């Protein structure tokens, strides 16, 4: 369960855009600065920038 330090505006069809304070389930975070998160609000998947998120 990570937190999006800020609303992330994705630009590709791989990462999803989140908001500040939004919670996203982290999936794979060992590739680089991009991990695959899963929004629990609707139920979708989309990478996310580690600099806009933090481990809570």
């Amino acid at each position: 369960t990570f937190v999006a330090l800020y609303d992330y505006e994705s630009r590709t069809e791989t990462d999803l855009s989140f908001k500040k304070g939004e919670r996203l389930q982290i999936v794979n975070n060992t590739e680089g600065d991009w991990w695959l998160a899963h929004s629990l609000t609707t139920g979708q998947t989309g990478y996310i920038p580690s600099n806009y998120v933090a481990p809570s």
């Binding site: 330090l5 800020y6 992330y8 505006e9 600065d33 920038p49 580690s50 600099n51 806009y52």
Partner: peptide, 7 residues
């Protein structure tokens, strides 16, 4: 496969 400009 660059990160965005943090706020």
């Amino acid at each position: 496969x660059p990160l965005p400009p943090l706020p």
